[PDB]
Amino acid sequence: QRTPKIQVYSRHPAENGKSNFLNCYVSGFHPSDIEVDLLKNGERIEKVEHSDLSFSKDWSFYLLYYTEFTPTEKDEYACRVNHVTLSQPKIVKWDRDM
Amino acid sequence: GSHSMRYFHTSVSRPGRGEPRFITVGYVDDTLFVRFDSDATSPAKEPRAPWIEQEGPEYWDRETQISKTNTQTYRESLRNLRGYYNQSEAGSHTLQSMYGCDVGPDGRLLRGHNQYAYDGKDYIALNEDLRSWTAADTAAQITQRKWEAARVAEQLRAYLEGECVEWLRRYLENGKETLQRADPPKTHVTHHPISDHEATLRCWALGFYPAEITLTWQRDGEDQTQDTELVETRPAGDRTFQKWAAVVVPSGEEQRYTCHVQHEGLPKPLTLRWEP
Amino acid sequence: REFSKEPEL
C-alpha cells in the first residue's frame, strides 16, 4: 500500500476578494479508494468536484478535487484526506505561498 | 514534437459490494479526452476534450462496446488472478493496465506499450519488440504461456503500429490548436524569511503545458539537487500545470542563487533571481 | 481509438 501525497493550492495566484479555484491534488496512492473533503474554517464545503481517476507510470493513482472560492485575509481553507494507509484523516492547510 | 496516446484500465473487486468496478481513461500527452465508468448510471464512453466530440455515432458505439466487453474480461481476469495466488474470495484486489503508442515529430512510431499490474505490482508487459512478454513471477508465466499460445502479441503489434499511430495522428490534427500548442511557464521568484539567519527562495512555474518541465536552483553555478525542495508537478484545473522549487539560503546570500527553467514552450531557457 | 481484443489474464 502507498499513502497519498497531498497538495493544497489555488488555480491562480490568490488575491483577497477575487474568485479563484481551491485545489486539493492527491497522488501517489494505492489502492484507489480515497475520501477527500475541502474545508472552510473547519467545515465541509458542499460544492466540490473532482477529476477522473487516473494513474501514473508507477501504477499509483491521482485525483484533483476542486471548488470555486473567494479567498480572504482571515478565512482558513484545508483539505482532509482518508485512505486505508492512514490511522486518522490527514488535514493539510492551504498556504497561499505554496 | 513527440506525442503519445495511452489508455488506462482499472478494475477493482469489492466482495460484498457488487461486481468489480471497471474504469477507463484515455490521454493524448497530458490531455484526458475520454472516460468510461461501469458504476455510472448509464455506462458509456464519454468525451472529455472538445476535439473528440466531432467523432460520429459509429465511433462512440464501438468505444462503448469495447469498454463494456472489457468490464467483463477484467472480472474474469481478477477471478483467475485470485486463483493464481491462492487468495481468498474475501479480499479486494486491483488489476490495472496501460497501453498505447509514442510517435516522433514526423508521426512515425517510436515504440508501443502494453503492460499490467496486480495489486500495484508489475505483472506482465509486452516487450519493446512487440513480439515477446516479460512475466514478473510464476503466476504471470501462466498468463504468458496462454498469450503465447494464442499469439496475442501479434494482435497488439498490428494495433500499435497501425490503428494506434493513425488515430493518434488524427487526434493531433483535430486538436492541433491545443494538443500541438506548448504554453510556456510564467515564472517568478519569491522570498520568505524563516528566521534572522535564513530565508526560503521559491522559484515558481505556472500556467504551462505540457507537464514536462525542469526547474533547478544553482548556488555559484553549481546545482543544489540535495538541498532543493521540489514539489510534484500539479494540475491547475484549466489544462495547465504548476511546479515550484525552493532552497533555504543564508540571510544576505540571495544573489548567489539562480533558478533555471526549461520547457518546450519557451523560446529560450530562463535564468531567474530574487529581485527585491 | 481503443484496442478491441483485450485478452483474459
Is there a contact between B117 and A9 if contact means CB atoms under 8 Å apart? no
Out of A25, A28, A32, the one facing B235 most closely (by C-beta) is A25
Q: Would you state the cell numbers that stand for residue B134, as one nine-digit string? A: 516479460
List C-alpha distances in Å: B124 to A21, B73, B136, B147, B221. 40, 16, 6, 11, 44
Inter-chain touch B70–C6, beta carbons under 8 Å: yes
Q: Minimal Cα distance from A12: which residue of B? A: B236
Of A9, A33, A57, the CB nearest to B234: A9
B–C CB contacts, 8 A cutoff, strictly below: 50
Hey, is the C-beta of A66 within 8 angstroms of any chain B C-beta?
Answer: yes
Amino acid code (one letter) for B47: P
What are the distances in angstroms from CA A26 to CA A8, B234, B245?
9, 10, 19
C-alpha cell at A56: 501514473
Identify the structural domains of chain B with CATH numbers, from first to last: 1-181 (3.30.500.10), 182-272 (2.60.40.10)
Residues A45, A38 contacting (CB under 8 angstroms): yes
3-state secondary structure of B79: helix
Q: DSSP letters of B127-141?
A: -TTSS-EEESSHHHH
Cell digits of residue B30: 497530458
CB contact (8 A) between residue A30 and residue B98 = no
Say yes or no: B12 contacts chain A, CB-CB below 8 A. yes
Place of cell 468489480: B20
Question: This structure's resolution (angstroms)?
Answer: 1.5
Nearest-by-CA chain A residue for B48: A52
Sheet holding A90-93: strands in order across? A43-44, A35-40, A77-82, A90-93
Non-local (6+) Cβ contacts of B18 within 8 A are none
> Which residue type, as a one-letter code, is found at position B111?
R
Look up cell 505483472; give the residue.
B123
State which amino acid sits at residue B34: V
Burial A1-17 (b: 16+ CB within 10 A, else e): ebebbbbbbbbeebeee
Which of A42, A37, A48, A35 shows the shortest CA–CA distance to A82? A35
A33 touches B at CB < 8 Å: yes
Residues of A in contact with B202 (CB under 8 A): 97
Other Cβ atoms less than 10 A from the Cβ of B160: the count is 23
H helices of chain B, where? 57-84, 138-149, 152-159, 165-174, 176-179
Instruction: Round to whole Å and give the CA distance between B24 and B63.
Output: 11
Domains, chain A, in order of start with CATH, read 1-98 (2.60.40.10)
Torsional class of B151: left (φ above 0), alpha (ψ -120 to 50), beta (otherwise): left
Q: Chain C residues with CB inside 8 Å of B163's CB? A: 1, 3
The residues near A19 (Cβ < 8 Å, ≥ 6 apart) are A68, A69, A70
> HSE-up of B254 (CA within 13 Å, CB side)?
20
Task: Tell me the residue length of chain C.
Answer: 9
Q: Do the beta carbons of residue B127 and residue B133 sit within 8 Å? A: yes
- Strand order across the beta sheet in which B31-37 lies: B46-47, B31-37, B21-28, B3-12, B94-103, B109-118, B121-126, B133-135
Torsion of CA A42, A44, A47, A52, to 10 degrees: 100
Task: Mention every residue, 6+ apart, whose C-beta is less than 8 A from residue B12.
Answer: A31, A32, A33, B20, B21, B92, B93, B94, B95
Computed from CA positions of residues B24, B29, B32, B33, in that sequence, does the dihedral angle turn out positive or negative? negative
B103-131 exposure pattern, b = at least 16 Cβ within 10 A, e = fewer: beeeeebeebbbbbbbbbebbbbbeeebe
> Does a cis peptide bond (omega within 30 degrees of 0) precede residue A31?
yes
The DSSP output letter for B183 is B
